[PDB]
Amino acid sequence: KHNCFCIQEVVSGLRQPVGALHSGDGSQRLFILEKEGYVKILTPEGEIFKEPYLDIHKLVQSGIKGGDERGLLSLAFHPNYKKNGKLYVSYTTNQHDHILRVVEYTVSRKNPHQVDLRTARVFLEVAELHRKHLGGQLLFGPDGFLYIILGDGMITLDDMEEMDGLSDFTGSVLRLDVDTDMCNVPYSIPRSNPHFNSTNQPPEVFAHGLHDPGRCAVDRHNINLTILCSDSNGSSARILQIIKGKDYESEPSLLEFKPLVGGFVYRGCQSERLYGSYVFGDRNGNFLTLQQSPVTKQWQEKPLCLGTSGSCRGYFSGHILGFGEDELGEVYILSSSKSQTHNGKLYKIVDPKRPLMPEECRATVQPAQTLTSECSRLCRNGYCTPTGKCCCSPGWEGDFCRTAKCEPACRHGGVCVRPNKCLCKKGYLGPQCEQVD
Ligand SMILES: O=S(=O)(O)OC[C@H]1O[C@@](COS(=O)(=O)O)(O[C@H]2O[C@H](COS(=O)(=O)O)[C@@H](OS(=O)(=O)O)[C@H](OS(=O)(=O)O)[C@H]2OS(=O)(=O)O)[C@@H](OS(=O)(=O)O)[C@@H]1OS(=O)(=O)O
Ligand SMILES: O=S(=O)(O)OC[C@H]1O[C@@](COS(=O)(=O)O)(O[C@H]2O[C@H](COS(=O)(=O)O)[C@@H](OS(=O)(=O)O)[C@H](OS(=O)(=O)O)[C@H]2OS(=O)(=O)O)[C@@H](OS(=O)(=O)O)[C@@H]1OS(=O)(=O)O
Ligand SMILES: [Ca+2]
């Protein structure tokens, strides 16, 4: 047993952590998601900032029982967050049982370590009848589009035919183009989408037929895009390769051998031998590798063992709640135990055959800077699209929505100050300064 990997505790004191990811800005911050509705920052020196990066625990409806999937579900940073400060979160909230929101946020202009809560911009609201099979994973592909993985919500045919106003998004991989200059809608539909300009099915839907998906593995590489998801109907533990336009109802898995939390594609630097592997794990820490045959394109699973090497250990506390990836590509376990309140932990996966810092893995921290995009500076009245288009609130216009509109116009030298509000010169009265005193 010389081929094993091992697990290194990085931080503890977390409250039900569900995942972790970086923001791609060079700062090597790791953002840890906590189920009740928090996002904490872990610095590359290993400190957790006191102030959460994002606190939406009052907006978030979370569940005390473990099988209750309600809470904060996923987070994705825009590929160009370093310049536009855009991020996307999915979470459950109250309004029949609850609503699954996908919302855009922008980091604050003054503080690169805190989101501006005022910049919430709702993209989707998906009705939910039950508290399982939710999904919620947000991710960006090499194409630059935003993918959204939704489970079936345990919604039956009778539930949907009877109750109108159910979203029809449940059970689907949605693909959005968030880089729009259009102001009438929060996102535009990619033309590559299979139901683009098609009245029969929602244009957002990229694929469907998902039931209870885990965290899906996303490969970056060099042809197109590969997304592998675990799914368990309810036992029925299958793994699916996501392709455009496919219906995965009664679809076999890539594997017959053999519930899984999810998986990841290792693109880190610390392990050479693991580079490019698809890895999936269950809640108890049993891990497997998926290898595709270049010849047949069939998939095969092999076990991946953990073993102790010094303080890099072959075991960890509690159950795996989620996975993480840092800006260097290394991967993490998020686990929690019952016990006290904050018994959640962040662990790193380590290849003990290799140094912790091989020469080629060195990378200089570029500390996070405040936004400098022209839009964020000057877009006073309205919101900025991820492209930098300043979208005016009603009653405003100009390149950055600085000039208010007055219809009819202010008279006698009056100034249009706010929408349809005229500041009159002394001696002139009325809503447009039209009456002479
Ligand atoms: O089936 S699983 O192995 O994936 O387990 C997940 C289910 O755990 C439940 C019910 O499990 S059961 O009692 O064994 O039928 O939650 C409650 O029980 C488990 C028992 O764990 S065990 O390893 O499956 O035996 C508790 O976990 S444990 O800490 O005792 O290991 C649950 O706590 S938790 O899942 O760790 O958060 C316990 O709930 S509670 O935290 O004590 O309140 C179901 O989850 S629950 O209903 O949300 O509590 C899960 O099954 S479900 O069908 O998805 O509901
Ligand atoms: O321990 S549980 O079996 O309760 O697992 C927790 C989830 O089970 C529900 C519904 O899930 S399901 O039945 O698997 O589809 O509760 C259901 O199970 C118990 C039976 O207890 S038992 O010992 O596990 O058999 C019922 O309680 S009882 O009245 O039979 O004593 C539940 O009734 S109720 O839903 O609480 O009203 C029964 O629901 S049902 O027969 O399917 O309608 C869920 O409980 S609930 O949602 O709180 O009502 C649990 O899922 S949860 O949504 O995460 O809470
Ligand atoms: Ca999930």
Author numbering: 213 to 307, 315 to 440, 445 to 457, 461 to 484, 490 to 570, 573 to 670
Please share excerpts from the published article on this structure:
Hedgehog-Interacting Protein (HHIP), the only reported secreted inhibitor of Sonic Hedgehog (SHH) signalling, binds directly to SHH with high nanomolar affinity, sequestering SHH. HHIP is composed of an N-terminal domain (HHIP-N) that shows weak sequence homology to the cysteine-rich domain (CRD) superfamily, typically involved in small molecule-binding. The C-terminal domain of HHIP is composed of a β-propeller and two EGF repeats (HHIP-C). Our data suggest a multimodal mechanism, in which HHIP can bind two specific sites on the SHH morphogen, alongside multiple GAG interactions, to inhibit SHH signalling.
We also determined the crystal structure of a HHIP-C:SOS complex, which exhibits the equivalent anti-parallel, dimeric HHIP arrangement bound to two SOS molecules coordinated at the same site compared to heparin. In summary, our HHIP-C crystal structures in complex with GAG molecules identify two discrete GAG-binding sites on the surface of HHIP-C, which are distinct and non-overlapping with the HhN-binding interface, thus suggesting that both GAG- and HhN-binding can occur simultaneously. To experimentally validate our HHIP-C:GAG complex structures, we generated a HHIP mutant in which 6 positively-charged residues involved in GAG recognition were mutated to glutamate (K277E/R328E/R350E/K569E/R610E/R613E, HHIP-C Glu mutant) and analysed binding to GAGs. Using surface plasmon resonance (SPR) with GAGs immobilised on the chip, we observed that the HHIP-C Glu mutant almost completely abolishes binding to heparin, HS and CS, when compared to wild-type (HHIP-C WT).
